[PDB]
Design an enzyme around this catalytic site. Structure first.
Site, PDB file in Angstrom:
ATOM      1  N   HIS A 159       3.319   2.406  11.679  1.00  0.00           N
ATOM      2  CA  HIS A 159       2.093   2.315  12.620  1.00  0.00           C
ATOM      3  C   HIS A 159       1.923   3.467  13.353  1.00  0.00           C
ATOM      4  CE1 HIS A 159       4.345  -1.364  11.712  1.00  0.00           C
ATOM      5  NE2 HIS A 159       3.381  -1.974  11.415  1.00  0.00           N
TER       6      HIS A 159
ATOM      7  N   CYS B 200       0.675  -1.308   0.064  1.00  0.00           N
ATOM      8  CA  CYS B 200       0.076   0.125   0.029  1.00  0.00           C
ATOM      9  C   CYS B 200       0.931   1.215   0.001  1.00  0.00           C
ATOM     10  CB  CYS B 200      -0.776   0.051   1.206  1.00  0.00           C
ATOM     11  SG  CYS B 200       0.078  -0.073   2.677  1.00  0.00           S
TER      12      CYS B 200
ATOM     13  N   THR C  92      -6.683   0.835  11.520  1.00  0.00           N
ATOM     14  CA  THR C  92      -6.870   1.362  10.115  1.00  0.00           C
ATOM     15  C   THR C  92      -7.068  -0.240   9.304  1.00  0.00           C
ATOM     16  OG1 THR C  92      -4.458   1.234   9.950  1.00  0.00           O
ATOM     17  CG2 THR C  92      -5.485   3.321  10.125  1.00  0.00           C
TER      18      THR C  92
ATOM     19  N   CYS D  73      -8.535   1.742   6.171  1.00  0.00           N
ATOM     20  CA  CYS D  73      -7.945   2.606   5.180  1.00  0.00           C
ATOM     21  C   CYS D  73      -8.193   1.763   3.991  1.00  0.00           C
ATOM     22  CB  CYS D  73      -6.531   2.447   5.090  1.00  0.00           C
ATOM     23  SG  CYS D  73      -5.777   1.090   4.996  1.00  0.00           S
TER      24      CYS D  73
ATOM     25  N   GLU E  79      -0.132   0.063  16.381  1.00  0.00           N
ATOM     26  CA  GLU E  79      -0.994   1.155  15.874  1.00  0.00           C
ATOM     27  C   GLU E  79      -1.990   1.763  17.236  1.00  0.00           C
ATOM     28  OE1 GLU E  79      -3.086   0.998  12.287  1.00  0.00           O
ATOM     29  OE2 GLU E  79      -4.689   2.298  13.163  1.00  0.00           O
TER      30      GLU E  79
ATOM     31  N   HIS F 171       5.467  -4.543   9.216  1.00  0.00           N
ATOM     32  CA  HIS F 171       5.420  -5.901   9.909  1.00  0.00           C
ATOM     33  C   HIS F 171       5.862  -6.912   8.825  1.00  0.00           C
ATOM     34  CE1 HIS F 171       2.880  -4.306  13.532  1.00  0.00           C
ATOM     35  NE2 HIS F 171       4.110  -4.564  13.918  1.00  0.00           N
TER      36      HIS F 171
ATOM     37  N   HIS G 264      -1.491  -4.016  19.889  1.00  0.00           N
ATOM     38  CA  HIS G 264      -0.725  -3.615  18.484  1.00  0.00           C
ATOM     39  C   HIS G 264      -0.106  -2.331  18.537  1.00  0.00           C
ATOM     40  CE1 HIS G 264      -0.542  -2.454  14.410  1.00  0.00           C
ATOM     41  NE2 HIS G 264      -0.724  -3.849  14.224  1.00  0.00           N
TER      42      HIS G 264
ATOM     43  N   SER H   8      -1.254  -7.216  11.162  1.00  0.00           N
ATOM     44  CA  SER H   8      -2.598  -7.587  11.390  1.00  0.00           C
ATOM     45  C   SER H   8      -3.388  -7.557  10.194  1.00  0.00           C
ATOM     46  CB  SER H   8      -2.865  -6.441  12.363  1.00  0.00           C
ATOM     47  OG  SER H   8      -4.380  -6.591  12.933  1.00  0.00           O
ATOM     48  N   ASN H   9      -3.062  -6.470   9.118  1.00  0.00           N
ATOM     49  CA  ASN H   9      -3.997  -6.577   8.038  1.00  0.00           C
ATOM     50  C   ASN H   9      -3.776  -8.077   7.159  1.00  0.00           C
ATOM     51  OD1 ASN H   9      -2.407  -6.024   5.196  1.00  0.00           O
ATOM     52  ND2 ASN H   9      -1.435  -5.430   6.740  1.00  0.00           N
TER      53      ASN H   9
HETATM   54  C1  LIG Z   1       1.785   0.494   8.995  1.00  0.00           C
HETATM   55  C2  LIG Z   1       0.554  -0.415   9.054  1.00  0.00           C
HETATM   56  C3  LIG Z   1       0.035  -1.412   7.889  1.00  0.00           C
HETATM   57  C4  LIG Z   1       0.769  -1.964   6.977  1.00  0.00           C
HETATM   58  O1  LIG Z   1       0.744  -3.480   7.217  1.00  0.00           O
HETATM   59  P1  LIG Z   1       1.730  -3.931   8.393  1.00  0.00           P
HETATM   60  O2  LIG Z   1       3.277  -3.596   8.658  1.00  0.00           O
HETATM   61  O3  LIG Z   1       1.835  -5.382   8.219  1.00  0.00           O
HETATM   62  O4  LIG Z   1       1.235  -3.739  10.007  1.00  0.00           O
HETATM   63  P2  LIG Z   1      -0.187  -4.271  10.564  1.00  0.00           P
HETATM   64  O5  LIG Z   1       0.098  -5.123  11.544  1.00  0.00           O
HETATM   65  O6  LIG Z   1      -1.087  -4.297   9.588  1.00  0.00           O
HETATM   66  O7  LIG Z   1      -0.701  -2.747  11.222  1.00  0.00           O
HETATM   67  C5  LIG Z   1      -0.486  -0.069   9.788  1.00  0.00           C
HETATM   68  N1  LIG Z   1      -1.328   1.308   9.274  1.00  0.00           N
HETATM   69  S1  SF4 Z   2      -2.971   2.988   6.927  1.00  0.00           S
HETATM   70 FE1  SF4 Z   2      -3.386   1.694   5.341  1.00  0.00          FE
HETATM   71  S2  SF4 Z   2      -2.232   2.692   3.595  1.00  0.00           S
HETATM   72 FE2  SF4 Z   2      -1.451   3.457   5.622  1.00  0.00          FE
HETATM   73  S3  SF4 Z   2       0.264   1.902   5.945  1.00  0.00           S
HETATM   74 FE3  SF4 Z   2      -1.705   1.186   7.073  1.00  0.00          FE
HETATM   75  S4  SF4 Z   2      -2.436  -0.355   5.765  1.00  0.00           S
HETATM   76 FE4  SF4 Z   2      -1.014   0.930   4.526  1.00  0.00          FE
END
Ligand SMILES: C/C(=C\COP(=O)(O)OP(=O)(O)O)CN
Ligand code: SF4
Length: 309
Positions: free
Chosen positions: A74, A12, A167, A197, A126, A41, A124, A226-227
């Protein structure tokens, strides 16, 4: 067997920006560059940066005087930001803009001594950062993870109450939590929907389409993403075997043995090369050319600060 690829999937705008920030800082200042928390992550990304001279820490005390320090994508609490400011440090902030937007709203409610509720996952980074934008003992900042948490929460003044979200949540589950919040606190205010998001919404939509076609779903992403976890979870709930995996080496043959159709996606922090290697491994296991699914076209980009090119 058929190999299908979800679209969208992978990086993203916030992740791409955060990585570029660390890379450019390394290029411009050399090693070492300190980073508060894993920048994103993803093990592959983090391992690479570590070998290139980035050192990942959780607390500002472990950073020495005169260092360069970058906050992860985050986000961080106001306490962390202030500690960094009070120390002799040069600071770059790789916090995704779409996280910052949520922070600003929590800070506003704090100034007013008015309570806020965050929907998100305890522990977490964030959530720690967003809850850490609130510092008024007269108001309040409460974390809920589920409708049950809502059913148990009491607040000081339900007439002056707002909500915010993490998010990267499940779109479906978050809907349920908001529904609960509005039933218990009819005067609660928030955004039109939530703070999930575009990338989260889009990747969950994309894995829903993928799972409708595929029998097994492989989600490229690290255990602490997490995502990425929400994508695997979504597919499992649809009745598909779904595996969260860091790389092709993680693929067990039994998973795909007699499977006519396998789907692949990637969380927001997983680089495309990991997906290509996953596909390469599935082709060793009898898969053909990877077919990309048609999907929503993303067009958002977040530039690095000017100081970092
Ligand atoms: C930085 C962020 C997402 C990007 O993916 P990630 O680094 O795997 O983090 P998360 O564990 O999904 O928050 C949360 N906005
Ligand atoms: S808020 Fe959404 S676009 Fe921004 S880093 Fe996290 S997952 Fe990616």
């Amino acid at each position: 067997m058929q190999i299908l690829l979800a679209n969208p999937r992978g990086f993203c705008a916030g992740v791409d920006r955060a990585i570029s920030i660390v890379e450019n800082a390394l290029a411009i200042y050399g090693a070492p560059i300190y980073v508060r928390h894993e920048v994103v992550h993803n093990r592959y990304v983090v391992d690479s940066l570590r070998e290139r001279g980035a050192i990942f820490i959780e607390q500002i005390s472990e950073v020495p005087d005169g260092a360069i320090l970058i906050f992860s994508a985050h986000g961080v609490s106001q306490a962390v930001r202030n500690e960094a400011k009070s120390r002799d440090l040069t600071v770059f902030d790789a916090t995704c803009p779409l996280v910052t937007k949520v922070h600003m709203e929590v800070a506003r409610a704090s100034r007013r001594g008015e309570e806020s509720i965050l929907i998100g996952h305890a522990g977490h980074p964030e959530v720690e950062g967003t809850m850490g934008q609130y510092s008024n003992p007269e108001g309040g900042m409460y974390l809920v993870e589920s409708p049950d948490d809502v059913w148990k929460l009491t607040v000081k003044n339900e007439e002056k109450l707002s909500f915010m979200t993490q998010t990267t949540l499940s779109v479906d589950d978050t809907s349920d939590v908001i529904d609960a919040l509005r039933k218990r606190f009819p005067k609660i205010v928030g955004p039109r929907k939530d703070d999930i998001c575009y990338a989260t919404t889009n990747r969950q939509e994309a894995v829903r389409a993928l799972a409708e076609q595929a029998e097994v779903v492989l989600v490229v992403g690290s255990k602490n993403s997490s995502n990425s976890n929400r994508l695997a979870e979504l597919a499992q709930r649809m009745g598909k075997r779904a595996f969260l995996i860091d790389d092709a080496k993680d693929i067990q043959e039994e998973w795909v043995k007699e499977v006519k159709c396998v789907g692949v996606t990637a969380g927001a922090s997983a680089p495309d090369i990991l997906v290509q290697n996953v596909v390469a491994r599935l082709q060793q296991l009898g898969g053909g050319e990877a077919i990309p699914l048609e999907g929503r076209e993303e067009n958002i980009v977040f530039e690095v600060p000017k100081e970092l090119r």
